[model samples]
Target: SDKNVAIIGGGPVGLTMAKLLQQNGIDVSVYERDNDREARIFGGTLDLHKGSGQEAMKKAGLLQTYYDLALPMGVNIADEKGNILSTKNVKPENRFDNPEINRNDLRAILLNSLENDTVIWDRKLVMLEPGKKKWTLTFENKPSETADLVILANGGMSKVRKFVTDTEVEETGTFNIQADIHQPEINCPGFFQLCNGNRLMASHQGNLLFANPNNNGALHFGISFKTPDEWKTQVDFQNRNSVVDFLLKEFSDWDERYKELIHTTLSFVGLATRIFPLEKPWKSKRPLPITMIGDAAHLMPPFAGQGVNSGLVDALILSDNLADGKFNSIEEAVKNYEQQMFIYGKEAQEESTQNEIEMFKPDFTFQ
Candidate 1:
């Protein structure tokens, strides 16, 4: 543990790694691309599972605080016509098992637990080079930093992934279009009423709608559907009007109540679902002590809700291997982590792929 460690990215996984290592007397610094802690994270809420995400928080000594900040949202299954099929309401006994936490809140929890300046912001890494003693990290318009060990916790689109893995992120032929509405109760009362202060899920003929009613006082939702290759290339996903028009036309046959969600949306984000195939092993030999954690290692779709959870598990095991004195050197510890990650990470990818397939079926429902 006498090495200077550098972690790229300041997402939940990276921050959690920093927390675990610092508490264990490891010198670490997280290089973040974001400007600061207050930067907004787009997308939706996350439900950290007990076995995976919560385990990392527990190991980091922040499990109780996670429960305190996270909202225990129950699931409400609905049909296409807005008919409520089943309701699993939140109860006190099982509230902490799998609770939904806003992305920003989760990031804040991990950030607050770290020491001051533990995460150095605005350092967007552009390249990595190995020297005789240390690995040099080159950042865009920022000074370079060298470290004895480097771990890439950046997201799936990391530029440095080629250095570690030959795997490429493949498109899954599904499109996920997300929308957010501020003051949802006032702007879209009909849709908000259907949500009923809980998470809502509806699926029909390969189209799925998932909504989180109370995401930090705003409604966050996404619609998933298979898109034609031509439409995928032609559509302007960044434009709100283009997305709204497409949704309105594509969902014409659905109930009018669902249309309110699209009409009242304040912002839109479109993502072509992709997955990093983990069936093949990453490069065995490296120039120096370097590896990856989180999405950088195993990126899967969000259907199984296992992306962040699996990444958290990566942080937990990798940090433990580095700090426990169980291996001869940091490189051995990293190799162990990578070997262990392949087992669990491949399982997560398979589960997520199965869920994505199940979700797009004509008879799919939130069973």
Candidate 2:
């Protein structure tokens, strides 16, 4: 607890780790790349599982706040024609089981729980060097800082991973086209109505559509399929109209109602899904106390919905192990956490990969 702990990235996992460490009387600081706490994070909604993400929040004493802000949505599986195929209603008993929360709201919940000035925004870490006594973290356009212990919770694509592990992030061969509709009711009335105040999922042939009806009042969705060979050079994601045309052509045969959502889209973001393979070994020997958690440690596709949840588990286990009197030395604690992480993390990755393969089948469906 006497050591100065520096965490890279002010994301959910990083902030949650700081909260846990601060409560344990550990001196911790979070270096974030974002200019400020109010930066908008674009992505789909996330649902924390009971034993993983929820457990971390409960430990941080913010589970009730999370529930208050999160919306418990039912699952509606529809065919391409917009016909309601099946629905899984959320009852009172299981309503809180896996409620969905927006990224901004979740960030606010974690930010509010931590002490003021805990996160140092605009400190984009670019280099991490191991010194004899401490590790030096160099940031973009900021003075370097040294910490007795360094925790890398930045993200999957963090450049600082080279200091802790040798594993490289690999593409899963599946591409995702993310779209957000600000005023769903006015823009995509038909598709919004089909959602029926619940999450909707539709698939046809090899294409899949997963939409979240509630995301800061915007309808957020992702269209995923097998990676096309020339997609990288063929489509220009910046021009909304070009992406719209591409989606229209891709889903030309889909239900007209489904195409309605595409025609009235506000923005389009595209990226290839990637994951950090666990088969590679993390360096056992290090000059200083350093470790990685969250996406930096285990990155996987969103197919199984375990990416964030698994990262939360990493925070929980790592924090517990780092607590006073738990281990003889900091290295022992980190080693134990990494060893345990490999087992559970590998399982999550395997499950996610399997789901991605099965979900992209030509005849796949939500059923």
Candidate 3:
């Protein structure tokens, strides 16, 4: 095939997809908005599930690399006061099976696996025009490039998804503010001890807070709650204090230890819960061959840890379809993968939704 393939986004999913295609001797390019690999620190740690995330890595031949960087951890159940109430010890089998790794670390492993120049950094896709033979891809302050096939692997907020289908991106009435507690051992020792080298979850009065001790030696946390009607009228989430003030008021009655972690946080990031349900097919008549994977195809809350895992599955499956000789054309492989994606992606989305709903319940408990 003389036609080149292009993937938007340099995330783990997109990079994994590039690895798969390149391994099969297909020409592919990944366009990402970030200025470079070191542009900024990526998100918190991710624990790849056995059958989904790990499966994808196994195919990409990076499973061992993931294991090399993964840190074994235990789960702790804590109260709002930062007291560890109970700990669920993992079995020996799971100790090495599903370990957590920093998002940046995982990205590094995937990036190193890909061939050089496969990822074109600083290419923020601003405009995508469909043409007869290929799609016109434009970037911010970068020259445009055309490809015979396009893969959209960017996360849920992808601007290029409009070229695919009209499925609406909807909110789940839930929102979370993420905070990074840098130098936790020095600044927030209590929170670090509370984590105990594991994922810690605490919930009270329908509000949830989870703290993770990343392998990178930083303590990361997220506070999630149901959207309040009054908040829309008062706070501008853009203002860091506005969000922090809201959190202070919401958890004022809880515990000081909890607030200690918040007060010492070096920075804060907030995002309203949103999902792109796979209930409808994203495939349609296209002028050329194209497909979408990862968050671009099915975006969901991180409650079930399916957001990244789902995209990994997408990468593995779609890449296999494209490389396998069974498919005669790129369009057929993409369409088939989309159909198969709906089944598993829907299951993941449903689980994520249920987890989010239960989290907001007045009497809900973290499982």
Candidate 4:
């Protein structure tokens, strides 16, 4: 179909794009690498910002749905001593300000907003070619598909980006470890009480430890530090016992309560650390009738928690442009989107990078 739009990567951004386009009466198809929605464990909790994420939800008419799953008044800040730092009670005013939601629930809400058969699962994009005024996408299986417009919502490891933008993704020297545990009180009671019902963050000299309450009384914990890629290679992350032992030894000087979180984890430990080169002036040459959103367009550190928010903003802005009929040509509209995206994305990327650097600096203050 001439009006059909092909979107790559069916994560939150892709699903949101699908929903927005479908609501606008446009035909949309999504290509995802996962065999199904349950391919992986998804992700931990994410706080949606009022300015971007919440705004995007309002535009998509999913604000109520997001509010229903949001964990109200869940933000908390603490020090290494496990003392109360700062807390916010979830309320209507702040509910729409910075609401936290489980990554799985957010995906479900966005997916539900779309009509059946809108998302095509397991369509891993192997390659792409630009045709006359359109894009041809080749997947792992089935015949290739063509579309009048292509929105690359694929994540940081996007394959389609190289064809358009010449920006290089630099590796920031940091790594993270993620693990989940059930009934932190019974299984890991010490760590459980330390976290309470809110998210906890502790940092010192460029290293950070975070813990958050999950649905069903589970605890999601992550550790981030500046380290070389070869660091993980030297250690065996698949070995749970070894990982836990190493973690305990690493934070041995901290208060015992903080150490309990690492010692009592039950699931396999996963690393969330990676480095990507920052590309300046993220503009694409050739000006094809295509654009990118989310991490596909701007990859940044997790310190600012703006990855999802920025992507959501991308969808809202692009949808507004399409809906308003503000541009005479689709190419012109895309160029405008790219220009604004680059400017905003650069600011986000730089700010996030600076936050990551400062979080590890000596005498760092918690907010």
Best-matching candidate per lDDT: 2
Tens digit of per-residue lDDT, candidate 4, span 169-237:
666767777888777777777767766777778886556888776554578878877774556356678
Tens-place lDDT per residue, model 3, 112-184, is 9888888998899988888889899999888999988889988888877776788878989987888777788
| Candidate order (TM-score) | 2, 1, 3, 4
Model 3 poorest 10 in a row by lDDT: 88-97
RMSD of each predicted structure: 1.3, 1.3, 1.8, 2.4
In the predicted model 1, the residue pairs found to clash are none
Q: Give the whole-model CA lDDT for all candidates, comma-separated.
A: 0.86, 0.87, 0.82, 0.75
TM-score for each model: 0.97, 0.97, 0.95, 0.92
Tens-digit per-residue lDDT, 244-291, candidate 2: 888998898887778989988878899889998899779877888899
For model 2, which pairs clash?
A: none
TM-score of 2: 0.97
Candidate 2 stretches greater than 4 Å from native = none
The candidate, 2 or 3, that scores higher on lDDT is: 2
- Each candidate structure's count of clashing pairs: 0, 0, 0, 13
